[PDB]
């Protein structure tokens, strides 16, 4: 009964691939709670779109300069 509204009124849903492919913005911000990550989703999306990801974590000055 909770998701009946979503099932009946709305007849379309957007995933990460659609929101990446259907946005004018060149910058995307991704969020999740602790002890879970979606880096593999972005890696899979980049592989499917035939692009290259430069994974650069932050936290140190040398890595900031490289960034």
């Amino acid at each position: 009964a909770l998701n009946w509204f979503k099932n009946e009124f709305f007849v379309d849903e957007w995933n990460i691939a659609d929101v990446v492919a259907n946005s004018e913005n060149n910058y995307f911000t991704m969020a999740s709670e602790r002890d879970v990550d979606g880096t593999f989703k972005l890696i899979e999306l980049a592989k499917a779109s035939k692009e290259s990801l430069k994974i650069i974590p932050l936290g140190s000055i040398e890595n900031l300069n490289y960034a």
Partner: protein, 898 residues
């Protein structure tokens, strides 16, 4: 001329240091050829320094040089980094040791002292008329190389070090091959165990065991091989009691392995069908061997649950083998699962459960020593990444112990480096780029982390880093199997019942005692009990008496008031009898002599505490002394140190360090971020000074380091690799300073509220439930000390007679009810009273030659009353002081004090 002698000694020490630095400079640039052309400006500076040193030497024969050498030491950093890149194992050495090893143009003897640092399980090198015959292990085992290697006079260190590194692997493989051939010929292992090194015998025995077990699995019979392995175990146990120390260690390790073999065969015999038998055989570790390999060193591979790992054939010596619990086997299985895709094996759980030792046992089963690092907040991104590029070039396995202690920013920053290392290992990349410097990647490298989650002052691993590791939980270890197998190794008659009683008694003590913050009775205390029971077999034998004595000496000193009564009741209930205690006449006499020379009085409780401390430290290396403030910890350990010096004759040096006074950068050290050199701290400086042994007396002297402050966790778990059985101090710069057996650490504190279980279990704790000295004895000792700090005998006698026990105790009990600001117990304030009264009497003695006895006694009593007032009620208001002077007037012919 004491000042002149001290100045001469300081000048001699400075000249010796300058001579050593100049010798290193001559070895690196002044002696070797084709080496000054690398850096021309540095060559010119070295030539100028050589000219200045020659002029100074001529002037001395008939500070500025040391300063110039220190200044040009910065210009040698690039050359040192290139030298480290030449031989990858030099990454475990500092700049000073690198200069020492590269300046050995023809002596070739300073290399041998560093083998423990570079290799891990090799102590010295055997030399024979300028030719290396073999390498010597730490545990005393002697390895003979396959062929002698001739040394050239103009050869460089790194080339012959590399050929020695390969020769060690070749020799170990040769010994394994002919040992395996001899066991295939049908001989027994009893004659082989006195002929070859331990590693070859172990590997050949494992290969033979898995081949015979697979042959038996081709049928459905298991009884004959089980009986044969049982007879072999009994024969090895018989041979254990009649062999030398090296053979004793080797036989003990082979007996551990054969006990594991018998356990696996017995588990396979109890199967009902063949499917579960095959599953159980696939779950355990197997040691197969290639039959058509043209390369010698890759002919042995390890199979477990369908995954294959390569044997490295690196020398490990005779390490302390571990008992193969089922949890250890499952940990080996998940480590092989993680390493099949070149990930990092990760172990998480409470402290004292066997994580780092499980990783080390896995490495030893894979035939390579595992270098262990102790992470800390000071391990920033550059240092940790330098350690990673150090361990990738060597190919040695890095086990980052206490991975939670890292700062979170470093934890997130090193994720890219760890992912790059994993991807290079998986894709077979020849080179990787870390720190903007392309470095080789040995295919044998791997990383492990062992973190202890859910602690105070510990960071949390981000998920993008946890996805590169594989967490495995070891919350519950198997103490029963470890205790049973170790007690069977030691030679106890009834191992099973005794081990079950030990484990049940430990759990009963854990579950039926007052739950205070330091009553931790897991696996470390059981291992300590067994290690303390090992020396007791000489004078107590293998039986119940040794076990109860070891349990007393290990557990009892860390108990309170009711807890020790509970422990005694449980010891009487669960064990058949309590043995007669040790005679201990010599140590008691030495302790009493030390106390007499130190002014203390030997009561029952203080002597009991001293004896407990002595018997605890006899096996345990690092101790924590816990008690109330002003309880007698310093007096206890100082008296025991003096007693040891009297009894054994070994000189004692004490290096008292206050932990919280100094910052960490001044305690352990700090990487100078300006141009990346290591500046020694204080504890590190002490450790390096005692390791190098310039004076030559530390070989026959004990060294005691006292951390006389609170146990701040940020200061204490920087030493987790020192407190445990690793006995190394893993510096940020890769320096692996070993802990000598005569290097003991004492912790002097008052509370354990903010400490962590990671350091309580590592040290034998000593608890002071109440004060060790009575009031009157303390007053008498303080009076004796004040008299020693200075007719006189009559004055001292009457002063001591004026301190009547009944009146003084009544005054001290009456002083407790007053309201005190800055609350101090009246036990602590007696020093002020004694010193003030003694000083007042000493000040007024100048007019005591012309006074009557009654007047003199009344004056001295008045001064004593005033001192007692101002040292007991000195921190109280006017009304309280008036009440107390009235009380002391009532409680003492004495002159009235208003």
């Amino acid at each position: 001329l004491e000042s002149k002698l001290t100045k001469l000694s300081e000048i001699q020490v400075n000249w010796v240091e300058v001579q050593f630095y100049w010798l290193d400079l001559y070895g690196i640039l002044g002696e070797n050829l084709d080496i000054q052309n690398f850096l021309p400006l540095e060559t010119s500076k070295f030539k100028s320094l050589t000219s200045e040193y020659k002029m100074i030497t001529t002037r001395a024969f008939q500070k500025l040089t040391i300063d110039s050498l220190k200044m040009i030491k910065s210009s040698l950093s690039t050359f040192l980094e290139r030298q480290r890149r030449q031989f990858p194992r030099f990454y475990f050495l500092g700049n000073d040791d690198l200069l020492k090893i590269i300046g050995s143009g023809k002596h070739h003897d300073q290399v041998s002292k560093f083998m423990k640092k570079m290799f891990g399980s090799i102590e010295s090198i055997i030399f024979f008329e300028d030719s290396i015959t073999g390498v010597r292990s730490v545990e005393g085992e002697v390895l003979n190389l396959n062929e002698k290697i001739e040394l050239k006079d103009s050869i460089q260190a790194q080339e012959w070090l590399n050929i020695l590194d390969t020769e060690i692997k070749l020799s170990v493989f040769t010994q394994f091959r002919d040992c395996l051939g001899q066991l295939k010929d049908g001989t027994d292992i009893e004659v082989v165990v006195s002929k070859y090194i331990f590693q070859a015998i172990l590997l050949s025995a494992q290969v033979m065991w898995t081949e015979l077990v697979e042959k038996c699995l081709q049928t459905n019979e298991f009884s004959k091989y089980w009986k044969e392995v049982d007879m072999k175990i009994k024969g090895l146990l018989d041979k254990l009691n009649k062999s030398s120390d090296n053979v004793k260690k080797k036989i003990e390790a082979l007996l551990v392995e054969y006990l594991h073999f018998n356990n696996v065969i017995g588990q396979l015999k109890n199967c009902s069908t063949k499917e579960e038998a095959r599953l159980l055989w696939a779950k355990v570790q197997k040691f197969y061997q290639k039959n058509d390999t043209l390369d010698d060193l890759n002919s042995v591979f390890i199979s477990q649950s369908g995954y294959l790992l390569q044997y490295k054939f690196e020398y490990i010596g005779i390490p302390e083998r571990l008992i193969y619990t089922p949890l250890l086997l499952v940990g080996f299985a998940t480590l092989t699962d993680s390493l099949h895709q070149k990930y990092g094996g990760c172990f998480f759980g409470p402290a004292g459960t066997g994580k780092t030792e499980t990783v080390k046992a896995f490495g030893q089963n894979l035939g390579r020593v595992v270098v262990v690092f102790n992470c800390d907040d000071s391990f920033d991104y550059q240092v940790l990444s330098r350690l990673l590029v150090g361990i990738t070039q060597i190919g040695a396995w890095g086990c980052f112990d206490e991975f939670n202690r890292l700062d979170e920013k470093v934890l997130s920053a090193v994720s890219a480096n760890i992912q790059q290392i994993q991807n290079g290992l998986q894709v077979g990349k020849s080179h990787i780029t870390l720190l903007e410097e392309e470095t080789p990647l040995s295919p044998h490298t791997a990383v492990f982390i062992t973190l202890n989650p859910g602690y105070n002052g510990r960071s949390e691993l981000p998920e993008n880093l946890k996805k590169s590791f594989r967490e495995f939980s070891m919350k519950s270890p198997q103490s029963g199997t470890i205790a049973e197998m170790i007690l069977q190794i030691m030679g106890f008659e009834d191992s099973k019942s005794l081990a079950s009683k030990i484990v049940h008694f430990l759990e009963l003590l854990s579950s039926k005692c007052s739950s205070m913050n330091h009553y931790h009775f897991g696996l470390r205390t059981l291992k300590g009990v067994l290690r303390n029971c090992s020396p007791l077999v000489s004078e107590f034998g293998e039986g119940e008496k040794t076990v109860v004595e070891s349990l007393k000496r290990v557990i009892l000193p860390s108990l309170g008031d009711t807890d020790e009564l509970v422990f005694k009741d449980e010891l009487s209930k669960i064990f058949d009898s309590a043995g007669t205690p040790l005679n201990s006449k010599a140590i008691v006499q030495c302790l009493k002599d030390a106390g007499q020379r130190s002014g203390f009085s030997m009561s029952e409780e203080f002597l009991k505490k001293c004896m407990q401390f002595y018997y605890m430290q006899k096996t345990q290396q690092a101790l924590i002394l816990v008690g109330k403030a002003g309880c007698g910890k310093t007096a206890t350990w100082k008296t025991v140190i003096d007693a040891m010096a009297i009894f054994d004759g070994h000189a004692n040096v004490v290096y008292v360090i206050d932990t919280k006074v100094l910052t960490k950068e001044s305690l352990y050290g700090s990487m100078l971020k300006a141009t990346l050199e290591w500046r020694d701290g204080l504890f590190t400086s002490i450790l390096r000074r005692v390791n190098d042994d310039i004076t030559g007396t530390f070989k026959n002297s004990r060294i005691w380091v006292v951390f006389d402050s609170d146990l701040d966790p940020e200061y204490v778990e920087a030493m987790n690799s020192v407190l445990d059985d690793n006995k190394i101090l893993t510096l940020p710069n890769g320096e692996r300073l070993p802990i000598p057996p005569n290097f003991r650490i004492l912790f002097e504190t008052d509370n354990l509220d903010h400490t962590t279980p990671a350091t309580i279990t590592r040290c034998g704790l000593l608890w002071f439930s109440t004060d060790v000295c009575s009031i009157s004895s303390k007053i008498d000792h303080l009076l004796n000390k004040s008299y020693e700090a200075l007719e006189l005998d009559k004055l001292k006698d009457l002063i001591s007679d004026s301190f009547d026990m009944a009146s003084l105790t009544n005054i001290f009990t009456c002083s407790n009810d007053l309201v005190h600001i800055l609350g101090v117990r009246t036990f602590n304030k007696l020093e002020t009273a004694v010193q003030l009264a003694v000083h007042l009497i000493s000040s007024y003695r100048q007019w005591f030659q012309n006074l009557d006895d009654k007047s003199l006694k009344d004056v001295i009593t008045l001064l004593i009353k005033r001192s007692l007032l101002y040292a007991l009620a000195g921190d109280s208001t006017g009304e309280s002081q008036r009440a107390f002077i009235q009380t002391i007037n009532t409680y003492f012919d004495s002159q009235e004090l208003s």
